[PDB]
Design an enzyme around this catalytic site. Sequence first.
Site, PDB file in Angstrom:
ATOM      1  N   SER B 117      43.464  61.258  93.123  1.00 26.06           N
ATOM      2  CA  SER B 117      44.452  60.265  93.816  1.00 26.06           C
ATOM      3  C   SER B 117      45.504  60.531  93.018  1.00 26.06           C
ATOM      4  O   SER B 117      45.679  60.195  91.942  1.00 26.06           O
ATOM      5  N   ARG B 118      46.740  60.878  93.843  1.00 23.78           N
ATOM      6  CA  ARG B 118      47.912  61.141  93.360  1.00 23.78           C
ATOM      7  C   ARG B 118      48.475  59.787  92.964  1.00 23.78           C
ATOM      8  O   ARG B 118      49.193  60.009  91.657  1.00 23.78           O
ATOM      9  N   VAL B 119      48.291  58.858  93.629  1.00 23.13           N
ATOM     10  CA  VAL B 119      48.541  57.461  93.390  1.00 23.13           C
ATOM     11  C   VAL B 119      47.889  57.149  92.057  1.00 23.13           C
ATOM     12  O   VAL B 119      48.476  56.296  91.241  1.00 23.13           O
TER      13      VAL B 119
END
Lengths: 238, 255, 264, 131, 47
Positions: B117-119
């Site tokens: 999850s880059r987020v």
Amino acid sequence: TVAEYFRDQEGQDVLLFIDNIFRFTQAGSEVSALLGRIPSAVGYQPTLATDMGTMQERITTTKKGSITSVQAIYVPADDLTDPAPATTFAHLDATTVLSRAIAELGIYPAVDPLDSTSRIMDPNIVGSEHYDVARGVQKILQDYKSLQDIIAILGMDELSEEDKLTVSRARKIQRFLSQPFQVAEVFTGHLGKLVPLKETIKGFQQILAGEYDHLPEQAFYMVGPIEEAVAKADKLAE
Amino acid sequence: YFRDNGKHALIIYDDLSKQAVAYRQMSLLLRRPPGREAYPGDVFYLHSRLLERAAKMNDAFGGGSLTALPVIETQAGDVSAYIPTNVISITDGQIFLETELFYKGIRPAINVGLSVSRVGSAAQTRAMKQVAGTMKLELAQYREVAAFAQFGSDLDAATQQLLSRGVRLTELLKQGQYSPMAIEEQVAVIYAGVRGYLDKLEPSKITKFENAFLSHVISQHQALLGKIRTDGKISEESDAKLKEIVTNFLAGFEA
Amino acid sequence: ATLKDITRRLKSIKNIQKITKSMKMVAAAKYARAERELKPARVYGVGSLALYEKADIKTPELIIGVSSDRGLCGAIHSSVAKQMKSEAANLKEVKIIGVGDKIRSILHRTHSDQFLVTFKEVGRRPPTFGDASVIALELLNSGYEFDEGSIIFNRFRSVISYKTEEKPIFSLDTISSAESMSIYDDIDADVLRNYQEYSLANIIYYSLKESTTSEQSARMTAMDNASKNASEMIDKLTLTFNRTRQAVITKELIEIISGAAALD
Amino acid sequence: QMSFTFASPTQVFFNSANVRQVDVPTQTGAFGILAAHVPTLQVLRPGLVVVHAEDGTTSKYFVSSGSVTVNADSSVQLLAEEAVTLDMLDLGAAKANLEKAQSELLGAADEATRAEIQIRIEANEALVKAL
Amino acid sequence: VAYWRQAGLSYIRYSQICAKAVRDALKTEFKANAMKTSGSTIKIVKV
């Protein structure tokens, strides 16, 4: 085109972020097909070279200003052999590999240091002071790295403490690369500090020289100027 | 439409793989080029725009959202795979699922590092973040040693634990077939492991714990669960409430 | 080869690289432990023989190799092994022990019978004194007593080199009765023996350690070695890779580029 | 002086340390082997080893077994199989162990068990002397 | 040595019992440590 305005017209050093050339090239290439163009090996647009080239050639230092181009580069296929980056290399002369790890060491900024590189480091242009000190450093960092390998596994006084000293010097040097942060001061607190080159060259050289080694290392941590490191050095020696 | 009706909709696009094939075919049949890797170029664009049409909108759009969980079912970890490479440049992360765990019976499947999850965190419950923060790490270090001399070979004790811990967390990271959770249940159990309470257990029994533990809090500490849902978060009290519940309950679970 | 093949290979090599590397630290740790264990010990074994020396002896009348049950560590054991059963013809009575089992190779094929004992779990939880005594005691019971034993072990020099050793086993309590031992103005073929005895463990422990320490330290070494090899290959394969890939990519791109299209 | 090597796998205490005396339970009795003593070889016996270090001090020890080796020279090496400092040795346990020991002796089988028990008893005493 | 050497009992046998008896003895903190040097990965074969 915009940057040409700022360069020429505004006489500047325009900073051109191009993010990512990979996407650029790729974008061209997407069309290549459709254009019925023969692309290339690895699929690339045939024009990959020209595409890059003219464009890179259109970037420079005019004698008005510079369009200093900082290109964020997503790495196609995470190799560079993928022709374009190899080519890109032709146009790359300062190369940034960021070390996620170093950053992870809480080091901020925290590049891959040895792959924070430039073909343009020179005992000439950037002079030997820079160069050599750096060469000493780069080497040193590595040397420290070398010792890291030993010690890591074998616990300690697996070294002689000149190695330790260098290790330490390196650590300080390491830490000096950490710089407190302004933009993310909102997070970090402190501020983005700026390091005039001489203080830099001098700076590490001094640490390297152990002239500072009788002080702690977090000193250098979150510092711009070698003074700000020195000051913090003192400060960490309370 | 939902997005503009405020609504946060979830689309699972299942799968673009299938699409791609069809579409590619479509181009070809149209005689039209496909592209790179023999398959269309702007099928990326297809998707790029498709998926850009998914967004988290501001408030004007009733907070508008479409959360898109696009799916690709992989052949041979072909991520290298054209569209995957593509897609890799596009998503907000990718969820790597790993079979081995499945055969192992372990469900989840996942290879985590591959999962991303880059987020990351910004949409995360503090509750979880607070216990999970710690877990991610516990696994992280664990993972290197998760890899190290895995066999019947000692480790230093620190690591004998981390491994234990890690292993526990693995069980914990299993989740039953058709057995969804809720954040508190999760946080709860995470809390349990984080605060080490079940390293104690040799691994098989974790699953038993978790269920039992769950049915237990489900009985009482909905007080807590409800609460945790409420606070969205763990307070020091909630923690403290947890702390006993689990410890004792755990004690009860065991003995 | 086709990318698979490469991978297949790679796969393993990487594995190896780990495994060996793993084994490297694992060993290093063991080794490290063993390293620790040497201090009093050092003395202790050194001590153990420390007197058939001042007051001296020689026979005119138990051979034993003391090392590991270990390989992947290296051929350490073979080293002692070699240099053990290689001898045996001269001696006397023939009673040999290989404690250590990868030593029992160069010996293990001529007897199985003139072995007296073997130690197993050589190293492992690092081998020790008790054991040395343990193994010492019953050992005594045997019919060869100084048909001069030799104790063959790899006496460490470094974590990487040891020298495959022998020392001689004074089981004389006899010619040692004779001589400059009188000077040990009193002493008894009891207390004598009961030191000989006692030193058998001391040494035993020691030798055991010398060897085993050597071995374990060698195991790191072996495990290194492997990885040096690995490291390269891994690199190389990665090319082989690109290529087969590209070869591929390209080739299709051909097919694609009307190598199946306009020009079907 | 005697460079007294006082050892156990546990420990080398005096490591050829220029000691004046060590008092050593040899098997019959002992002797307080004084600073460089004649060769004589004696096999220990549990007792306490009392290392009258040259220094003024005597350090106390319990010894169980090994040999002290009294070289001609200054090297004396007590290589006590077991050589311990009394610190690590519990009087309480010793006693209790002794309690047991004595209990056990009665059903100890043969001189060897008895011996053992006794070794242990003797031992237990032999810590107990000092301890 | 008559209380052990009687018939048999090595100086080892003896010793070990002595030593064993030490192992038997000892104070506590200290007490863990004993078996560490003992016959432990003692696994005697002749093989």
